[PDB]
């Protein structure tokens, strides 16, 4: 990182929207019921041709399908330069969808949490415990300097306080500066000590139907709706895809290139 | 230059003092000086013009002297004097214009027009008398290699520069730390902005620095320092440094903390003021260093606490601003300022006659370019044309 | 004053404010309340419109100007809703299952539309820009679309076979169709029971205020996903009785009117 | 200077008065709406303060030129100086700090108040024209800082709001494709005449002639006459600066200078 000095008299460059569309890829994530209702085996081709009418080259818009919010939340691997997740709304899953958004709208620096040998804690408000798997049931036993438990016995898990049950993804936030013994099913879950670095600008979440319920910040005093969190009312999925295609320029203007240099080596759909 | 100035001063004194009814005792010395000027100029041929659209003009001096026997001046005497005065004023105006439109690189202090070079001859020094104006006085001091001094009300020392430096930046430009400034004329507005309000700063303090280099040394400068920058306190959409994209700025103004203004000369601290606002005196300096701090308020009301969250998004960006206005200063070099007119006169004459761009000054006499690259050669040519412009302003 | 986009109007920032114009506008303006049949059902009083007119008169309106129009429900009210009052206030009962229909109705009545007739049998239709929409109304509106290419052949559909078309509406009473711009579309609609119009959203409708009774903020009157603006004419209240809803509308009628601009 | 100009004017010779910050503009805080409607929510126009030696103008578009051709909204402002200025040093600054904060502004007829929520953008294609008798004398394109107007009686400031072709998400949010518009794109301009020369007498920031004349007239309760406005108010005087007013005012200014020699 170096200082950048700019002149406020500098002339605006021409639109780069065409070039970024030509040199980037767009990944769309939708629920399988969308494909069920559309009932057309060539609809990927149709959406690709419509996106070509919108500027994107053929073969740059990738369509990815997930069963539901709960399943998609197990290690979501976002591939393209720009990712748009069409997330169905359910009044019963307000937390989970939020968690999913909280997982994909932010960058996370995660390290393994070997609970069975080590005692863990959360240093600051950015530190969370992100647990993903088939069934994440997490119980917590707060501890203290004398190494005893507060309303929990380290030798008896039945006394561990309950914070997650049968979860595909859950973010656990406990009181900072306190050591907690953890009881989670390592067989059906993996828990990681994570820090949210900041917003993840290459991922937009469009909530299909419903109202504003997403809360991507653990702080109760903030429920910020960034430009990348859209929400559309719906009755047909074809209308949903038509609006995603038509306002694609608007959607991408709300997004920015990831810019984060990762330690990982994952697969990407890139040109 | 001194001879041209003396011609102009004699003509102005003649205009003001040779008036109907005045005692000859009031004008006797002036009449002697005027007749001496006639005697010196008589039989001398001059040619002005011939550059740009300035027309070539030929000047011949064969005049009679003014009478000396009157007790009081009458109408006849005034008209007789006024005819010669009119011709001489026309000549001096044309010589001043012919000099104002010319420049040289190596020897730009020396006269450039043929008429003024001829007037620099020894025989014309008889015309020379009282050199009392600030510009001619500084011209004579510079010729004698003495210390020079020009007083400027609001000196135009800072070239126009509206720029920003981002010390923390992202492609989405939403967690931005840096500063933006306008330097213009005698004004410097600076504003350091932290989008996170220094929540992650070590001691909740973000330090901002702004160094401005003056192209000439200023002395005896009265400056007013004010703790806000109205220029960077309203929302704006600003281009990016490459110009590719635009970012958003949504200031909320906090008072600057640990304000420290240093006036430096050759990198040495001459004057220093901490937490001082209003009128300050910078006695001798060439650089201004403004250091200020954004201190996160330890205690906040619910509205203030709502403005500044723990993490992103950041919609209200904390800003601390300083304003520095030089009201009066002294410089050893000529400068454009707010009260004088020499620059406007030189530019006006260069424009009215369509003077081609020369090898000294920037096109159109644009002050920003001149003061950005204020070289010694440019300073010499500028002092020459400014002295000529003042001499012209005595008559025209 | 009117709508002087054509010609300039100059004003001085020292011109003294006139007095309140609220009484004069109430005196010269007709007010209409659009409420569902359920409201009249829960209000067993038959002379209740008279009482509401009297209460408005206590609040300044002359006793011939406040009007009350009943609609069965949102679906039926969305069929050619005619608003002929200077100030229109639509009390719109909220249902979680009809969110898109609430949004379509509000978009239709909270905005001005320039609509031209459509002939899906005679011509193909494309949408020029983000303002060009298709607005279909009637008893039942079932709309299917086949996007064409530059060669007029269909994309993922066959022009001859309507079954291969893509379905954007079924049995609707009102629907706003927004397709990808610049692409010719062959259309199939139930013209017997569905009139479709090629419409352009000119701008907000300033004399119509929708008070959403109960619920939350679900209205999305913009086809752009990135924007879900809440204009000051889109109000929301929490309710258990309709009499209290009407009393709230009457008492803060000054606030409701100052949130709307009179008919031009 | 004043007696010299008096003698020159008696002889019909060219006069000259040098003014630091001449009070050449009568106070006028006004606005023009080029696009408007009774709700005052999608407004395009200009608002200006002409006061003394300062012009502060600002062109505002609520739609941010979304529908304007080429995404450019052209704003123009004209100030007709009541006397010709020569040898004028003028500062240009891109922004108008006076029209960059939110304000509630009366309607042209005063019936209602509208809302202004500026978000300031760099003025584009800035063009200052200094004209004399309807002819262009000086032109400055995209030039800021000190400029010289050699001889003019009219100032024509033409500027543009150019919608930025690229926007970051925070910026892209503020300017939606359609109404409602909450952040209105404003382009400023500030013009400051620092020093000029006028063939007529004017008030200015450095002299005391007007203040002396007004003080003398108020101290002895001089009834209003048929030449000057009541109280010697400079705005009324310069608005209707007739030749008769100019003659009387030059007379009293010369007398005030003569008095200042002693008092
Ligand atoms: C920018 O757009 C203009 C307008 O057509 C075009 O002439 C120019 O070539 C484009 N590119 C650049 C780099 O200016
Ligand atoms: C406005 O109100 C004032 C204050 O009572 C009243 O005197 C005046 O007549 C009213 N009407 C007008 C037109 O000013
Ligand atoms: Ca969960
Ligand atoms: Ca327990
Ligand atoms: Ca914690
Ligand atoms: Ca929260
Ligand atoms: Ca519908
Ligand atoms: Ca098909
Ligand atoms: Ca469309
Ligand atoms: Ca929307
Ligand atoms: Cl000043
Ligand atoms: Zn930048
Ligand atoms: Zn108006
Ligand atoms: Zn001054």
UniProtKB/Swiss-Prot annotation, chain A:
Keywords, alphabetical: Calcium, Capsid protein, Disulfide bond, Glycoprotein, Host endoplasmic reticulum, Host-virus interaction, Metal-binding, Outer capsid protein, Signal, T=13 icosahedral capsid protein, Virion
Entry GO MF terms: metal ion binding
Superkingdom to which the source organism belongs: Viruses
Region (LVD motif): 182-184
Residue positions the entry lists as glycosylated: 14
Biological process per Gene Ontology, one example term: receptor-mediated virion attachment to host cell
Entry binding sites for Ca(2+) 1: 40, 151, 159, 161
Residue numbers spanned by region CNP motif: 110-112
Region spans: GPR motif: 198-200
Residue sites binding Ca(2+) 2 per the record: 122, 173-174, 176, 246
Cellular component, GO annotation: host cell endoplasmic reticulum lumen; T=13 icosahedral viral capsid; viral outer capsid
Processing and modification events after translation: N-glycosylated. The N-terminus is blocked possibly by pyroglutamic acid.
Compartments (UniProt record): Virion; Host endoplasmic reticulum lumen
Statement: the UniProt record of this protein carries the keyword Disulfide bond: yes
Transmembrane annotation, as ranges: none
Disulfide bond residue pairs: 27-80, 110-194, 136-189, 141-152
Role: Calcium-binding protein that interacts with rotavirus cell receptors once the initial attachment by VP4 has been achieved. Rotavirus attachment and entry into the host cell probably involves multiple sequential contacts between the outer capsid proteins VP4 and VP7, and the cell receptors. Following entry into the host cell, low intracellular or intravesicular Ca(2+) concentration probably causes the calcium-stabilized VP7 trimers to dissociate from the virion. This step is probably necessary for the membrane-disrupting entry step and the release of VP4, which is locked onto the virion by VP7.
Family of this protein: Belongs to the rotavirus VP7 family.
Oligomer and partners: Homotrimer; disulfide-linked. 2 Ca(2+) ions bound at each subunit interface in the trimer hold the trimer together. Interacts with the intermediate capsid protein VP6. Interacts with the outer capsid protein VP5*. Interacts with host integrin heterodimer ITGAV/ITGB3.
Note from the entry: Some rotavirus strains are neuraminidase-sensitive and require sialic acid to attach to the cell surface. Some rotavirus strains are integrin-dependent. Some rotavirus strains depend on ganglioside for their entry into the host cell. Hsp70 also seems to be involved in the entry of some strains.
Name of the protein in question: Outer capsid glycoprotein VP7
Organism: Rotavirus A (strain RVA/Monkey/United States/RRV/1975/G3P5B[3]) (RV-A)
Taxon lineage: Viruses, Riboviria, Orthornavirae, Duplornaviricota, Resentoviricetes
Span of the entire protein shown here: 56 to 326 of 326
UniProtKB/Swiss-Prot annotation, chain D:
Binding site for Ca(2+): 133, 153
Presence of keyword DNA damage: no
UniProt GO molecular function: host cell surface receptor binding; metal ion binding; structural molecule activity
Annotated localization: Virion
A GO BP entry: fusion of virus membrane with host plasma membrane
Binding site for Zn(2+): 20
GO cellular component, one term: viral envelope
Keywords: Calcium, Capsid protein, Intermediate capsid protein, Metal-binding, Ubl conjugation, Virion, Zinc
Entry keyword annotation includes Ubl conjugation: yes
Disulfide bond sites: none
Main location: virion
PTM entry text: The N-terminus is blocked.
Annotated family: Belongs to the rotavirus VP6 family.
Assembly, per entry: Homotrimer. Interacts with the inner capsid protein VP2. Interacts with the outer capsid glycoprotein VP7. Interacts with the outer capsid protein VP5*.
Note: The VP6 trimer contains a zinc ion located at the center of the molecule. The zinc ion is not essential for either trimerization or transcription activity of the DLP. Zinc-depleted VP6 has an increased sensitivity to proteases.
Function summary: Intermediate capsid protein that self assembles to form an icosahedral capsid with a T=13 symmetry, which consists of 230 trimers of VP6, with channels at each of its five-fold vertices. This capsid constitutes the middle concentric layer of the viral mature particle. The innermost VP2 capsid and the intermediate VP6 capsid remain intact following cell entry to protect the dsRNA from degradation and to prevent unfavorable antiviral responses in the host cell during all the replication cycle of the virus.
This protein's name: Intermediate capsid protein VP6
Full-sequence range covered: 134 to 396 of 397
């Amino acid at each position: 990182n170096l200082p950048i000095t700019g002149s406020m008299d500098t002339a605006y460059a021409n639109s780069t929207q065409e070039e970024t569309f030509l040199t980037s890829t767009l990944c769309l994530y939708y629920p399988t019921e969308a494909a069920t209702e559309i009932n057309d085996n060539s609809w990927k081709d149709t959406l690709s041709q419509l996106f070509l009418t919108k500027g994107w080259p053929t073969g740059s818009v990738y369509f990815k399908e997930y069963t539901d919010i709960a399943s998609f939340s197990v290690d979501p691997q976002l591939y393209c330069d720009y990712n748009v997740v069409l997330m169905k709304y359910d009044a019963t899953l307000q937390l989970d969808m939020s968690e999913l958004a909280d997982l994909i709208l932010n960058e996370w620096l995660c390290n393994p949490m070997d609970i069975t040998l080590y005692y863990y804690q959360q240093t600051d408000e950015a530190n969370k415990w992100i647990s993903m798997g088939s069934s994440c049931t997490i119980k917590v036993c707060p501890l203290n300097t004398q190494t005893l438990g507060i309303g929990c016995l380290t030798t008896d898990t039945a006394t561990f306080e309950e914070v997650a049950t049968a979860e595909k993804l859950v973010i656990t936030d406990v009181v900072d500066g306190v050591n907690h013994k953890l009881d989670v099913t390592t067989a059906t879950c993996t828990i990681r000590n994570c820090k949210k670095l900041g917003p993840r600008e290459n991922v937009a979440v469009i909530q299909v139907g419903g109202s504003d319920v997403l809360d991507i910040t653990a702080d109760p005093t903030t429920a910020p709706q960034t430009e990348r969190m859209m929400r559309i009312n719906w009755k047909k999925w074809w209308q949903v895809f038509y609006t995603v295609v038509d306002y694609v320029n608007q959607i991408i203007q709300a997004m920015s290139k990831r810019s984060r240099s990762l330690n990982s080596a994952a697969f990407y759909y890139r040109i | 230059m001194d001879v041209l100035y003396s011609l102009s001063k004699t003509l102005k004194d003649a205009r003001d003092k040779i008036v109907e009814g005045t005692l000859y005792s009031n004008v006797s010395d002036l009449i002697q000086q005027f007749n001496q000027m006639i005697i010196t100029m008589n039989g001398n041929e001059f040619q002005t013009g011939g550059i740009g659209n300035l027309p070539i003009r030929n000047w011949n001096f064969d005049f009679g002297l003014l009478g000396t026997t009157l007790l009081n001046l009458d109408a006849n005497y005034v008209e007789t004097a006024r005819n010669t005065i009119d011709y001489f004023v026309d000549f001096v105006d044309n010589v001043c214009m012919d000099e104002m439109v010319r420049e040289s690189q190596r020897n730009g202090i020396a006269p450039q027009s043929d008429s003024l070079r001829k007037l620099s001859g020894i025989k014309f020094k008889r015309i020379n008398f009282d050199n009392s104006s600030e510009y001619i006085e500084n011209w004579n001091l510079q010729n004698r290699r003495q210390r020079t001094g020009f007083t400027f009300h609001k000196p135009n020392i800072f070239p126009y520069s509206a720029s920003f430096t981002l010390n923390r930046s992202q492609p989405a430009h939403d967690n931005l730390m840096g500063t933006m400034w306008l330097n213009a004329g005698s004004e410097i507005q600076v504003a350091g902005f932290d989008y996170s309000c220094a929540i992650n700063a070590p001691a909740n303090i973000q330090q901002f620095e702004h160094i401005v280099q003056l192209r000439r040394v200023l002395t005896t400068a009265t400056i007013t320092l004010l703790p806000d920058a109205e220029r960077f306190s309203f929302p704006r959409v600003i281009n990016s440094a490459d110009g590719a994209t635009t970012w958003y700025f949504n200031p909320v103004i906090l008072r600057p903390n640990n304000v420290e203004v240093e006036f430096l000369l050759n990198g040495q601290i001459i004057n220093t003021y901490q937490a001082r606002f209003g009128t300050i005196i910078a006695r001798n300096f060439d650089t201004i260093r403004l250091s200020f701090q954004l201190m996160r308020p330890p205690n906040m009301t619910p509205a203030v606490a709502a403005l500044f969250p723990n993490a992103q998004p950041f919609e209200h960006h904390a800003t601390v601003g300083l304003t520095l206005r030089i009201e009066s200063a002294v410089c050893e070099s000529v400068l454009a300022d707010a009260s004088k007119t020499m620059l406007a006169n030189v530019t006006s004459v260069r424009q009215e006659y369509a003077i081609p761009v020369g090898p000294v000054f920037p096109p159109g006499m644009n002050w920003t370019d001149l003061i950005t690259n204020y070289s010694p050669s440019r300073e010499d040519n500028l002092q020459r044309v400014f002295t000529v412009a003042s001499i012209r302003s005595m008559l025209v």
